[PDB]
C-alpha cells in the first residue's frame, strides 16, 4: 500500500530475479521506486544501455534498482500494464471508457495504483505514487502525473447531463483532448459557453489536468456508464511467466 | 520630521512620501515620475527637491509655465539654503518690450 512496488507482492505474486545482489552499506533509496533499499533486501545495479529515456523521473540517484521494480522494469510488466488499475485484489484493465466511468466516477475500492500509457510503451508503474484513498486518485499518463477526484467528476457529470438534458444531439460543454497534446485541451466550447453559466465555466476551468484528462474519456458524444473490469491479472501473469 | 529635507516643514504631510522617494531616486540619477493632485501643494515639494539638490553642489534647473513662476519663487525665498546658494530666473525675448515702439 505504501509504495508502487507493493503491487509486486500484495496483488500479484512474484519474486526477485536470479543473480540480483543483496544490499550492502548504508541504506539508500531505489533509483526508480523511491523505496529505501535496506540491508537484507535484494537489488540490482543499473546497467541500462543508452535507450532509457526516463532519467527525469528517477526518484533518487543511488544507481540501484529494488528487486520489485526490477520485476516492474521487465517488458511484460511494461506493455501489459499499459492501462490498468492495481487494487489490493487484482489488476483491472481500464482501456475501456466504461471502466474509466467505473474508477473515476464512484469507485468501490480505496487503495490502488492507476497507470495509463500515452505512447506505445513507457516506464510507468514505478514512477507513480499509490492512490491511497479514493477521494484523491493518483494517475500516471505518460510523463504526466495526474490527480482525479470522484465527487468533483460526479458534479461535473451531473452539471453536463442536466445542461445537455432536453437535447437529442450531445453537445460538448468543454473540450478535453484525449492525447492531452492539443493546445485546446481544457477550452470551453462556444455553445458550451452558452449552455454553462460563468460559475460553471470557472468550475470546469479550475479543475486539475487529471480531471480534465478523465473527462476527455468520460464526457463525449456517447456517454460511458460505470461497469467493473475484466481482470488482466492472470493475463499479465501469463505474460510474465 | 527628523533628517528632513530643506523646506520640508512647509510641505503638507500627504506629499512628504512622494518628496522623499523623489529626492532619493533623483539622487540615484533616474528621471522621476512624481504625480500629485492640484491642491496638494506641489510647489512646496518641488522647492524642497530643488533646495535638497542645491545643497549637494548641483546646478538645479526648474522648468515651469510663467503663471507657475511667481508661486514657485514664492516657495523659494524664505528657506535659508536657496538663500545661501542663490535663485535666479532665465527669461526670453517675449518677457520684454521694445522701449522706442512702446
Amino acid at each position: 500500500m505504501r509504495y508502487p512496488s507493493d503491487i509486486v507482492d500484495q496483488v500479484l505474486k512474484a519474486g526477485p530475479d536470479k543473480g540480483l545482489l543483496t544490499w550492502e552499506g548504508v541504506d539508500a533509496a531505489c533509483s526508480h521506486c523511491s523505496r529505501p533499499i535496506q540491508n537484507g533486501d535484494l537489488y540490482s545495479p543499473s546497467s541500462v544501455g543508452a535507450f532509457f529515456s526516463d532519467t527525469r523521473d528517477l526518484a533518487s540517484t543511488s544507481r540501484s534498482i529494488c528487486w520489485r521494480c526490477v520485476v516492474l522494469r521487465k517488458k511484460p510488466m511494461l506493455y501489459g500494464l499499459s492501462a490498468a488499475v492495481v487494487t489490493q485484489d487484482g489488476i483491472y484493465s481500464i482501456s475501456k471508457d466504461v471502466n474509466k466511468a467505473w474508477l473515476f466516477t464512484t469507485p468501490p475500492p480505496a487503495p490502488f495504483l492507476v497507470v495509463h500509457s500515452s505512447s506505445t510503451m513507457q516506464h510507468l508503474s514505478w514512477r507513480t505514487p499509490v492512490t491511497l484513498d479514493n477521494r484523491r486518485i493518483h494517475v500516471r499518463y505518460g510523463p504526466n502525473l495526474f490527480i482525479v477526484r470522484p465527487e468533483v467528476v460526479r458534479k461535473a457529470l451531473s452539471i453536463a447531463d442536466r445542461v445537455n438534458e432536453g437535447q437529442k444531439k450531445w453537445v460538448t460543454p468543454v473540450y478535453f483532448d484525449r492525447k492531452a497534446a492539443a493546445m485546446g485541451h481544457g477550452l470551453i466550447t462556444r455553445a458550451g459557453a452558452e449552455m454553462l453559466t460563468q460559475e460553471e465555466q470557472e468550475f470546469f476551468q479550475s479543475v486539475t489536468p487529471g480531471e480534465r484528462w478523465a473527462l476527455s474519456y468520460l464526457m463525449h458524444s456517447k456517454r460511458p456508464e460505470p461497469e467493473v473490469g475484466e481482470c488482466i491479472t492472470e493475463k499479465v501473469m501469463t505474460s510474465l511467466n | 520630521p527628523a533628517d528632513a529635507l530643506p523646506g520640508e516643514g512647509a510641505v503638507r504631510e500627504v506629499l512628504r512620501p512622494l518628496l522623499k522617494q523623489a529626492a532619493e531616486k533623483t539622487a540615484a540619477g533616474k528621471i522621476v515620475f512624481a504625480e500629485a493632485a492640484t491642491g496638494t501643494g506641489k510647489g512646496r515639494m518641488i522647492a524642497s527637491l530643488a533646495a535638497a539638490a542645491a545643497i549637494k553642489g548641483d546646478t538645479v534647473v526648474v522648468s515651469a509655465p510663467l503663471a507657475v513662476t511667481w508661486q514657485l519663487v514664492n516657495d523659494m525665498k524664505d528657506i535659508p539654503e536657496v538663500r545661501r546658494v542663490g535663485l535666479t530666473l532665465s527669461l526670453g525675448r517675449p518677457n520684454f518690450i521694445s522701449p522706442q515702439r512702446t
Binding site: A59, A181, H185, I188, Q205 | -
Partner: protein, 219 residues
C-alpha cells in the same frame, strides 16, 4: 503575523502537478540567496529550511512549515505548451566525418537514445497566485525580490513575475489548513477536500524519497 501573498505574472507559467507550496518557493529563493552569499559549492539541504515562516508541529512528531499552498485564480484559459528534443543529425554526420565525433553507430534512432526526438506537452496557466502563511513580511519581501520566475525555474522563459504583494489579514479569514498535512493533524485542521495519499509535506516536494503518508488538499 498571519499574512497573505499574491504573485501576478508577466509570463504564463507551468500549471503545477499537485501543489505549488509557498515554502518551496521560499526555500528555492533562500538557496539562490545562499548561492549568491557564499558561492557555488554548498549543500542546498542546509539552507532551504532557513525560512522566515512558522513551523507547525503535529501532535506526535511530523512537523511542517506554516505556509498554505498557492491557490490559483485563472486570468486566462488553461492552454497547453509543447516542447521537443532532438540532436541535429546533420551536424553529427559532419562531425563524424571530421573526426570530432566518435560514433560507431551508422544510424540514429528517433524513438530512443541520443538522437531521440521527444515531444511533450505541459499545461500553461496565466494566473493570480494567492497563498496564506504565518511569518515575517520583511523576509518574504527580501526573498521574493529575487523571484524572477515561479512554478517553473525553466530557464526557457516561463513564469516571469510581474510582481508580488504581501498583506497581513485576520485570523479567521486565512485558510492555512489548505496544505499537505500529516495524517495525525488536528481535527480542526482537516477539511473535506483533504484526502489521504503519498505526498511530500516539506522541503523538496519533487523528492519522492522524502514522500510520506500525508493528508493533502486538491488543486
Amino acid at each position: 503575523v498571519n499574512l497573505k501573498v499574491t504573485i501576478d505574472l508577466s509570463n504564463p507559467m507551468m500549471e503545477p502537478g499537485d501543489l505549488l507550496h509557498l515554502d518551496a518557493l521560499l526555500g528555492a529563493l533562500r538557496v539562490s540567496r545562499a548561492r549568491a552569499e557564499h558561492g557555488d559549492a554548498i549543500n542546498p539541504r542546509d539552507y532551504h529550511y532557513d525560512l522566515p515562516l512558522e513551523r507547525y508541529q503535529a501532535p506526535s512528531g511530523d512537523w511542517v512549515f506554516k505556509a498554505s499552498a498557492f491557490k490559483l485564480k485563472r486570468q486566462l484559459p488553461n492552454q497547453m505548451w509543447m516542447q521537443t528534443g532532438r540532436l541535429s543529425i546533420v551536424e553529427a554526420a559532419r562531425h563524424r566525418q571530421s573526426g570530432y565525433l566518435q560514433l560507431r553507430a551508422g544510424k540514429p534512432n528517433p524513438a530512443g537514445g541520443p538522437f531521440k526526438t521527444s515531444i511533450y506537452h505541459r499545461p500553461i496557466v496565466q494566473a493570480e497566485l494567492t497563498a496564506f502563511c504565518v511569518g515575517d513580511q520583511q523576509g518574504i519581501e527580501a526573498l521574493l525580490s529575487e523571484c524572477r520566475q515561479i512554478g517553473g525555474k525553466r530557464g526557457v522563459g516561463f513564469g516571469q513575475v510581474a510582481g508580488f504583494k504581501v498583506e497581513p489579514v485576520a485570523e479567521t479569514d486565512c485558510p492555512w489548513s489548505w496544505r499537505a498535512l500529516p495524517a495525525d493533524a488536528d481535527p480542526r485542521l482537516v477539511t473535506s477536500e483533504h484526502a489521504r495519499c503519498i505526498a511530500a509535506i516539506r522541503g523538496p516536494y519533487w523528492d519522492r524519497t522524502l514522500h510520506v503518508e500525508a493528508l493533502a488538499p486538491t488543486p
